[PDB]
Design a protein around this motif. Structure first.
Motif, PDB file in Angstrom:
ATOM      1  N   UNK A 169      59.815 -38.693  -2.996  1.00  0.00           N
ATOM      2  CA  UNK A 169      60.183 -37.549  -4.117  1.00  0.00           C
ATOM      3  C   UNK A 169      59.684 -38.153  -5.179  1.00  0.00           C
ATOM      4  N   UNK A 170      58.893 -37.842  -6.298  1.00  0.00           N
ATOM      5  CA  UNK A 170      59.050 -37.490  -7.892  1.00  0.00           C
ATOM      6  C   UNK A 170      60.173 -36.841  -7.910  1.00  0.00           C
ATOM      7  N   UNK A 171      61.393 -36.568  -8.719  1.00  0.00           N
ATOM      8  CA  UNK A 171      62.450 -35.334  -9.048  1.00  0.00           C
ATOM      9  C   UNK A 171      61.656 -34.656 -10.337  1.00  0.00           C
ATOM     10  N   UNK A 172      61.876 -32.673 -10.259  1.00  0.00           N
ATOM     11  CA  UNK A 172      61.622 -32.366 -11.171  1.00  0.00           C
ATOM     12  C   UNK A 172      59.705 -32.381 -11.148  1.00  0.00           C
ATOM     13  N   UNK A 173      58.967 -32.218  -9.848  1.00  0.00           N
ATOM     14  CA  UNK A 173      58.298 -32.641 -10.127  1.00  0.00           C
ATOM     15  C   UNK A 173      57.339 -31.795  -8.585  1.00  0.00           C
ATOM     16  N   UNK A 174      57.127 -30.530  -8.313  1.00  0.00           N
ATOM     17  CA  UNK A 174      56.986 -29.798  -6.870  1.00  0.00           C
ATOM     18  C   UNK A 174      56.180 -28.734  -7.205  1.00  0.00           C
ATOM     19  N   UNK A 175      55.135 -29.210  -6.367  1.00  0.00           N
ATOM     20  CA  UNK A 175      54.103 -27.611  -6.555  1.00  0.00           C
ATOM     21  C   UNK A 175      54.499 -26.622  -5.705  1.00  0.00           C
ATOM     22  N   UNK A 203      66.695 -30.011  -4.090  1.00  0.00           N
ATOM     23  CA  UNK A 203      67.634 -30.761  -4.556  1.00  0.00           C
ATOM     24  C   UNK A 203      68.704 -31.298  -4.013  1.00  0.00           C
ATOM     25  N   UNK A 204      69.342 -30.188  -3.580  1.00  0.00           N
ATOM     26  CA  UNK A 204      70.527 -30.760  -3.480  1.00  0.00           C
ATOM     27  C   UNK A 204      70.641 -30.587  -1.973  1.00  0.00           C
ATOM     28  N   UNK A 205      71.823 -31.575  -1.167  1.00  0.00           N
ATOM     29  CA  UNK A 205      71.340 -32.458   0.723  1.00  0.00           C
ATOM     30  C   UNK A 205      72.124 -31.280   1.608  1.00  0.00           C
ATOM     31  N   UNK A 206      72.658 -30.610   1.194  1.00  0.00           N
ATOM     32  CA  UNK A 206      73.607 -29.500   2.137  1.00  0.00           C
ATOM     33  C   UNK A 206      73.596 -28.403   1.872  1.00  0.00           C
ATOM     34  N   UNK A 207      72.689 -28.210   0.491  1.00  0.00           N
ATOM     35  CA  UNK A 207      72.223 -26.660   0.682  1.00  0.00           C
ATOM     36  C   UNK A 207      71.165 -26.222   2.288  1.00  0.00           C
ATOM     37  N   UNK A 208      70.488 -26.687   2.154  1.00  0.00           N
ATOM     38  CA  UNK A 208      69.592 -27.248   3.902  1.00  0.00           C
ATOM     39  C   UNK A 208      70.417 -26.808   4.632  1.00  0.00           C
ATOM     40  N   UNK A 209      69.957 -25.639   6.021  1.00  0.00           N
ATOM     41  CA  UNK A 209      71.222 -25.388   6.700  1.00  0.00           C
ATOM     42  C   UNK A 209      70.394 -25.452   7.791  1.00  0.00           C
TER      43      UNK A 209
END
Lengths: 216, 87, 96, 25, 121, 81, 97, 129, 206
Positions: B45-51, I67-73
Motif C-alpha cells: 500500500x502506497x501511503x497517502x494515496x487511496x480511492x 493508517x493507525x493499525x490499532x484503531x481497527x477493531x
RNA sequence: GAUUGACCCUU
RNA sequence: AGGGGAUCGAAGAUGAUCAGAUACCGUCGUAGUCUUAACCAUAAACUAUGCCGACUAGGGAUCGGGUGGUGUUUUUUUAAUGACCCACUCGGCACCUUACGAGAAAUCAAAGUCUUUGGGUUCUGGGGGGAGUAUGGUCGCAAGGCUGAAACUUAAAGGAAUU
C-alpha cells in the motif's frame, strides 16, 4: 483545564482543526461543548423558556424544570438545547451544553439577483416535531423575520435577516415549535441545488490526516 | 453558490454520497468515508494515496452498502468479477 | 384523490358542496337564517332600553350565596323579559 | 345513564308525546 | 444470611487476582497474612474477607473460576490458546464435493484433487 | 437493487417472470407438429388445446384439453415448432 | 385503543362464525374466539392403574383414555387460569409453552 | 382505472428517486411523458431514458441521478396565463433561481421560463426541481 | 486495479474448500446476496469462493489504507470467532473485542471500554448487531463476515462465507490477517506462503 | 366467583 | 296469518342470598326460538379503515391454480392414467424485526408516496349538550325507519395510558 477525551476533542485542543466547517463537512460526532465554544467564540446563548414538569409519586409530586435554550452566532451556526433538571440553574447550564453540542450550519441564500450578501434562505424548507410543522419561505430584502417570537429569535441567532414562516398544528407547544424550526433550518444544507450539483473530490477526514499526532 | 461579484459564499460546500449523489448532512452520523488503498506493481500500500467513497447513512441503513461498494469498486477497476450490472 | 373532486368541470360540485358544508358554521348559519332578527332578545342590536320590573328568587353560580336582586327587565321594542346584571358595587341605589 | 337506556327512555317519551298529540288532534 | 456483601466479595477477588501464590487454602494462615496484606478497619471484616478468599481458592483448586484472572492463570491460558498440534486438520485425510462445487472450481478455472459425489435429494 | 440493467435482464430471470411481467410480454405457449404412429398425418396443434383436436380421417384424437397444457395421447410423436 | 391486531379473536375473511357454548357457564362465544383446549386423560386417574391391572380379567389390557374438547369463554378461561393476563409485549406470543 | 399516465410516470420516478435507485421503469410511455422527460433531460434532472417498444403502448427506462428532488404533476391541467405563471411558480417551486413549472402551450410542451422567453402560455402540466 | 497476482490461487482454493467456506445457508436466501452460485439440491446453497476471495482482498485493502493499525477493531461474540479474533489482534494491531461487547463502547465516552475506532470487523452481523448499531452512531465503517442469510443492513463490506463452520470462520480470519500483513509489507514473503497454520484460529471446547 | 352498600369543602 | 312447537326461554310463576332484590343464582314457564307467504330495514351491520389505478427492506408459511426438476409407491423394481418433495410465476385469507416513510400516539407495507401540499371519484364531519329531540314530509300494520332543526345551556367534552 479541559483534558479532552475524544480524538476530535484532542485535535481541536491541539489546534489541528481551525474551523467548525471541517466538522460539518466530515460529519464527525461532536460530544464536547468545548469544541464548539473554541471553534465559535461569537456564539450567543439565551434561554427560550422554563416550564415545570411534575411526576406523581406516592408522596406528592416531584417537580423538575425543563429549560429550552438556543445557542447561536450572528451568522451561520445555531443549535437548540432542551434539558430537564431538579434546579433551574442546573437545567439552564445543561441546556446550554446540549445546545452547543447540537450546533448545525444554516444555508443562507438570496431571494433574487444575488446582489449583496446572503439575506434569506436558499429554498423553502420545513421541519416537523410532534404536530407542529414549521415552513420557512425565502423573503425579499427588507421584509424582516415574519415569525412568532420563539422561532423569530431562533432565526435571528441563526443569522437570516428576512424570511416568511408558516406553522401548522399546536404552535403553543414551544418545545415542539422550536424543534420543528430547528429541523427546518437544518434541512437547508441538505437540500440539493444545481449550484450544488458539481462533484467534489472527497478530501481526507481531519482525523485520518491527523492521526499521526496521537499518543503513540 | 456565489454573489454577482464572484466571491464564493456559503462556505462549506458539502459532500455527496458516491452511490446516490445526495447531500450528506452535517449530523448524518450514519454516513461513512471508505478509503481503499491501491497497490502499484509491488503488492504493498502506497501511503497517502487511496480511492475514497462517501457512503450515505440512507443506503447503509437500507442494506445496499455492500452492493454499492461492489459497484463502485468494479467501476473504478479495483474489483474484477463480483458485481454484475445485469441482475 | 383526497376526497374532493378535482376535474376541470367540477366547479358546480365544489360550489354546491361548499354551500352545503357552510351550514356547519355557527355564525354563518345564524347570519343566513336571521336568528338575530327573529329570536335574539335584542333583535340584533348592540344595546336595548328596558323597564326594570321586579325581584326574582335566583341564586348565583360558584362560589357564593347571594340572593338580593338581579334586574328583570321588560324591553320596549320587543316586550321580552331578560335578566340583566348591575355591573358594579353598591347596586342598591339604582334599582328603586 | 347507559346510552341504550337513555335511547329507550327517549323512545318512550316520543311515543307518549305522539299519543298526547293524537288525543289533542 | 450467608450471602456476602459486594465489598467483601470484591475485596476477596482483588486479593486473589494479585496475591494468588502468596496465600494458601488454610483460613488461619489466610487471615494471619491478610491482616498485613490488606488494611481493614474490622477484625470481623477481616475474618469475612479471608473466609471468602479461602472459598475462592477452594473453587479454583477444582476447575477455573470466572471473573477472577491472575498472572499464572493468564500465562497458562495464553499457552493453551497458542498451542497447536503438528498434524493439520486441513491436509489430505483420504474431499467430498458435489457437481456444483466441481463446476464452481471449473468455472473459476483451477485444478485440484477432489472426489465426484452425486447430488443428494 | 440500487443499480441494475432493466434494459438487458438475464434470460434466467426473464423466463422466471410471468409472461406479462417481462420487458416485452410474449406467449410462453408454443406449437407442435404431431404425428400418430402408423399414418404420419402431420397436423399442427396448439399446446393449450381447449379442444379434442382430431383429424377428419378417423377416431384418432391427439390431445385432451386440461386447465393449461393439453395432455397428448399415449401413442403420439410431437415435434416442437 | 385497539388492544390486539386480531381483535381478541381469530377471524379474517369470515364476517361471521357460528357460536359455541362455554363448558363452565354455557356462555355463547364465537368459535374462533374461544379458548378451546383438548383434554386427553387416562380413565383410571393414573393412580388406580395398579389396582385395575391386578383386578383385570384380561391381561395386557389396553386401558383406554378419554378424549374431549373444552371450549372456554374468555371470562371463564381467565378465571380458571387456562390463560392469564400477560404483559403487552408478550401478548404477541402465539407459541404455547 | 388508469387516469393520468403522466402522473403515474412522475410518481414512479419520485418513488425510485427517494428509494435511491439509479433507474426506473415506466408504463405506458405517453408522448406527454416523453416531452416531460425531454424537459427534465434538457435541464439535467434525469439523464438518459429508453423507449422499449412493445406494440401496445411502450415502456420507458429512465436512468436517474441524485439531482432530482421532486417531479410532480398538476391535475387538472389548469389554464394558465402570463399573469398566472408567476402565481404558479411562487406556489410550487423551492426558489426563484431553480426549478421549472412545465406547461403545454400552443408551441408544444415547455417550461415556464422558456414560455416567458417565447411569450406564450397554456395549460400547466407539472413541475421539476 | 489489481495486478493479476492477487487472484484465487489453487492452494488458497484448497484451503477454502477444506474449510467448507463455500457451503452457505439453507434455502433461506437474502436477496441482498448475489454471492450465491447454482443452489445445490437438498437446499444448501454454494457460496462463490472467487468473490469471497475478492471481497477478502478488498477488505484487506481498506484495513491497509486506514493508517493507525490499532484503531481497527475486531468484534466477535460467537463461541467460535473469539480465538480467531484474539489471534488476529495478536498478529496485527487490530484491537479486539471478544465475548461480550458492552453497550456504549463506541458512544459513551466515559466508559472504561470506550473505543473510537475507524473500522470494525464483525464476525457475524446477527450476533454482533449491537456493535454495528453503535458504529452507525459514530461513522465507523463495517467489514463483516456475512453468510447468505445474515442481516446485511449497516454493513459496508460483506465477506460471503460460512458463519456456522468453525473452520470457515477461522480460515477467513486467517486470510484477513495474512493479507493485511501482506499489503502492509510486514510479511515480505509475497510469493512464499505464511508459516502460521490455517488451523490456528480453531476453537477448542475442552 | 356469596354477603365489602355508602363517604357534603378549594390549584 | 297458517303450520310447527323437542330444547332453551323477554313476560310471568316461584325458592333462595339480601337491609331491600318484581336482579344476579335454582325449577317451571307463555311470546319467541323452526318453517310458509307478507312486512320490517336496523347492529360495536367493525377491519370502527369507501371504491378504482400506480409505485416503494425483506421473509417462515397457507388456499386456488399451478412454466419446470428423465426426484418416490400398488400394478411389471424393468411405458404409462396417483400423490407428495423442491425451483418457482399469477390471484386470494393472513402473518413475521428497526424504520424508507407516516402518525398525537397507540400503531400502520398502509393509516406510506400529504407545507417537496393536485391520479380519478362518491359519501360524511366542523367544540360539548339540548338531540337523533321538535316540526314538516315520506315509508311502515305497528314497533319504528329515512330526512331533520332552532331556542337555550355550556369551558371544556374528548383522543394515546406517561408516573
Amino acid at each position: 483545564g479541559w483534558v479532552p477525551v475524544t480524538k476530535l476533542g484532542r485535535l481541536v485542543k491541539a489546534g489541528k482543526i481551525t474551523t467548525i466547517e471541517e466538522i460539518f463537512l466530515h460529519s464527525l460526532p461532536v460530544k464536547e461543548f468545548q469544541i464548539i465554544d473554541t471553534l465559535l467564540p461569537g456564539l450567543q446563548d439565551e434561554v427560550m423558556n422554563i416550564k415545570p414538569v411534575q411526576k406523581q409519586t406516592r408522596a406528592g409530586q416531584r417537580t423538575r424544570f425543563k429549560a429550552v435554550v438556543v445557542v447561536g452566532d450572528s451568522n451561520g451556526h445555531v443549535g437548540l438545547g432542551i434539558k430537564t433538571a431538579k434546579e433551574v440553574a442546573g437545567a439552564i447550564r445543561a441546556g446550554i451544553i446540549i445546545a452547543k453540542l447540537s450546533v448545525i450550519p444554516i444555508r443562507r441564500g438570496y431571494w433574487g439577483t444575488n446582489l449583496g450578501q446572503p439575506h434569506s434562505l436558499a429554498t423553502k424548507t420545513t421541519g416537523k416535531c410532534g404536530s407542529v410543522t414549521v415552513r420557512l419561505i425565502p423573503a425579499p430584502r427588507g421584509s424582516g423575520i415574519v415569525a412568532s417570537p420563539a422561532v423569530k429569535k431562533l432565526l435571528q441567532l441563526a443569522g437570516v435577516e428576512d424570511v416568511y414562516t408558516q406553522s401548522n398544528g399546536k404552535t403553543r407547544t414551544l418545545e415542539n415549535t422550536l424543534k420543528a424550526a430547528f429541523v427546518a433550518i437544518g434541512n437547508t444544507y441538505g437540500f440539493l441545488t444545481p449550484n450544488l450539483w458539481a462533484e467534489q473530490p472527497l478530501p481526507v477526514s481531519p482525523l485520518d490526516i491527523y492521526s499521526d499526532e496521537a499518543s503513540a | 453558490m456565489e454573489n454577482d461579484k464572484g466571491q464564493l459564499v456559503e462556505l462549506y460546500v458539502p459532500r455527496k454520497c458516491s452511490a446516490t449523489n445526495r447531500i450528506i448532512k452535517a449530523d448524518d452520523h450514519a454516513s461513512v468515508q471508505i478509503n481503499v488503498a491501491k497497490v502499484d506493481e509491488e503488492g504493498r500500500a502506497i501511503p497517502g494515496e487511496y480511492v475514497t467513497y462517501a457512503l450515505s447513512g440512507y443506503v447503509r441503513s437500507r442494506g445496499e452498502s455492500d452492493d454499492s461498494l461492489n459497484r463502485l469498486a468494479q467501476n473504478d477497476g479495483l474489483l474484477k468479477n463480483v458485481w454484475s450490472y445485469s441482475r | 384523490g383526497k376526497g374532493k373532486p378535482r376535474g376541470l368541470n367540477s366547479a358546480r360540485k365544489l360550489r354546491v358542496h361548499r354551500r352545503n358544508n357552510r351550514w356547519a358554521e355557527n355564525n354563518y348559519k345564524k347570519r343566513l337564517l336571521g336568528t338575530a332578527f327573529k329570536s335574539s332578545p335584542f333583535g340584533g342590536s348592540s344595546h336595548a332600553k328596558g323597564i326594570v320590573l321586579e325581584k326574582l328568587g335566583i341564586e348565583s353560580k360558584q362560589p357564593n350565596s347571594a340572593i338580593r336582586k338581579c334586574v328583570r327587565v321588560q324591553l320596549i321594542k320587543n316586550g321580552k323579559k331578560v335578566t340583566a346584571f348591575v355591573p358594579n358595587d353598591g347596586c342598591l341605589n339604582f334599582v328603586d | 345513564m347507559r346510552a341504550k337506556w337513555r335511547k329507550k327512555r327517549t323512545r318512550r317519551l316520543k311515543r307518549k308525546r305522539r299519543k298526547v298529540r293524537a288525543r289533542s288532534k | 444470611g450467608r450471602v456476602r456483601t459486594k465489598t467483601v466479595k470484591r475485596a476477596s477477588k482483588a486479593l486473589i487476582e494479585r496475591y494468588y501464590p502468596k496465600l494458601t487454602l488454610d483460613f488461619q494462615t489466610n487471615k494471619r497474612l491478610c491482616d498485613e496484606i490488606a488494611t481493614i478497619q474490622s477484625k470481623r471484616l477481616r475474618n469475612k474477607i479471608a473466609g471468602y478468599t479461602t472459598h475462592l481458592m477452594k473453587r479454583i483448586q477444582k476447575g477455573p473460576v470466572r471473573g477472577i484472572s491472575f498472572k499464572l492463570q493468564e500465562e497458562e491460558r495464553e499457552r493453551k490458546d497458542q498451542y497447536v498440534p503438528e498434524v493439520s486438520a486441513l491436509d489430505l485425510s483420504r474431499l467430498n464435493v458435489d457437481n456444483q462445487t466441481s463446476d464452481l472450481v471449473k468455472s473459476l478455472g483451477l485444478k485440484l484433487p477432489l472426489s465426484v459425489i452425486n447430488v443428494s435429494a | 437493487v440500487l443499480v441494475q440493467d432493466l434494459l438487458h435482464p438475464t434470460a434466467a430471470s426473464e423466463a422466471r417472470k410471468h409472461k406479462l411481467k417481462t420487458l416485452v410480454q410474449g406467449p410462453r405457449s408454443y406449437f407442435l407438429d404431431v404425428k400418430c404412429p402408423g399414418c404420419l398425418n402431420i397436423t399442427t396443434v396448439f399446446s393449450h388445446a381447449q379442444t379434442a383436436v382430431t383429424c377428419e380421417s378417423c377416431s384418432t384424437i391427439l390431445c385432451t384439453p386440461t386447465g393449461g397444457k393439453a395432455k397428448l395421447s399415449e401413442g403420439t410423436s410431437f415435434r416442437r415448432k | 385503543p385497539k388492544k390486539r391486531a386480531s381483535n381478541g379473536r381469530n377471524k379474517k375473511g369470515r364476517g361471521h362464525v357460528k357460536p359455541v357454548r362455554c363448558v363452565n357457564c354455557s356462555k355463547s362465544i364465537p368459535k374462533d374466539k374461544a379458548i378451546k383446549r383438548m383434554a386427553i386423560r387416562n380413565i383410571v386417574e393414573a393412580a388406580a392403574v395398579r389396582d385395575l391391572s391386578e383386578a383385570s380379567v384380561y391381561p395386557e389390557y389396553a386401558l383406554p383414555k378419554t378424549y374431549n374438547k373444552l371450549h372456554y369463554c374468555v371470562s371463564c378461561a381467565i378465571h380458571a387460569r387456562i390463560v392469564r393476563v400477560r404483559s403487552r409485549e408478550d401478548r404477541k406470543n402465539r407459541a404455547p409453552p | 382505472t388508469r387516469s393520468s399516465v403522466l402522473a403515474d410516470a412522475l410518481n414512479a420516478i419520485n418513488n425510485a428517486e427517494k428509494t435511491g435507485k439509479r433507474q426506473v421503469l415506466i408504463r405506458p410511455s405517453s408522448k406527454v411523458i416523453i416531452k416531460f422527460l425531454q424537459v427534465m433531460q434538457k435541464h439535467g434532472y434525469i439523464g438518459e431514458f429508453e423507449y422499449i417498444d412493445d406494440h401496445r403502448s411502450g415502456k420507458i427506462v429512465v436512468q436517474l441521478n441524485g439531482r432530482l428532488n421532486k417531479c410532480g404533476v398538476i391535475s387538472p391541467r389548469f389554464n394558465v396565463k402570463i399573469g398566472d405563471i408567476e402565481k404558479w411558480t411562487a406556489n410550487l417551486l423551492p426558489a426563484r433561481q431553480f426549478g421549472y413549472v412545465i406547461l403545454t402551450t400552443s408551441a408544444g410542451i415547455m417550461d415556464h421560463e422558456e414560455a416567458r422567453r417565447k411569450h406564450v402560455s397554456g395549460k400547466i402540466l407539472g413541475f421539476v426541481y | 486495479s489489481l495486478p493479476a497476482t492477487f487472484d484465487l490461487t489453487p492452494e488458497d482454493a484448497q484451503l477454502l474448500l477444506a474449510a467448507n467456506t463455500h457451503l452457505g445457508a439453507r434455502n433461506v436466501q437474502v436477496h441482498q446476496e448475489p454471492y450465491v452460485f447454482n443452489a445445490r439440491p437438498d437446499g444448501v446453497h454454494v457460496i462463490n469462493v472467487g468473490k469471497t476471495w475478492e471481497k477478502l482482498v478488498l477488505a484487506a485493502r481498506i484495513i491497509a489504507a486506514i493508517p493507525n493499525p490499532e484503531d481497527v477493531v475486531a468484534i466477535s461474540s460467537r463461541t467460535f470467532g473469539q480465538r480467531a479474533v484474539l489471534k488476529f489482534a495478536a498478529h496485527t494491531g487490530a484491537t479486539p473485542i471478544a465475548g461480550r461487547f458492552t453497550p456504549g463502547s463506541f458512544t459513551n465516552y466515559i466508559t472504561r471500554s470506550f473505543k473510537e475506532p475507524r473500522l470494525v470487523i464483525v464476525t457475524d452481523p446477527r450476533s454482533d448487531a449491537q456493535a454495528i448499531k453503535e458504529a452507525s452512531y459514530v461513522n465507523i465503517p463495517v467489514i463483516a463476515l456475512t453468510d447468505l442469510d445474515s442481516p446485511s443492513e449497516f454493513v459496508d463490506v460483506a465477506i460471503p462465507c460460512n458463519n456456522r463452520g468453525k473452520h470457515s470462520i477461522g480460515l477467513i480470519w486467517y486470510l484477513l490477517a495474512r493479507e493485511v500483513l501482506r499489503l502492509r509489507g510486514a510479511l515480505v514473503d509475497r510469493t512464499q506462503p505464511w508459516s502460521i497454520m490455517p488451523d490456528l484460529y480453531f476453537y477448542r471446547d475442552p
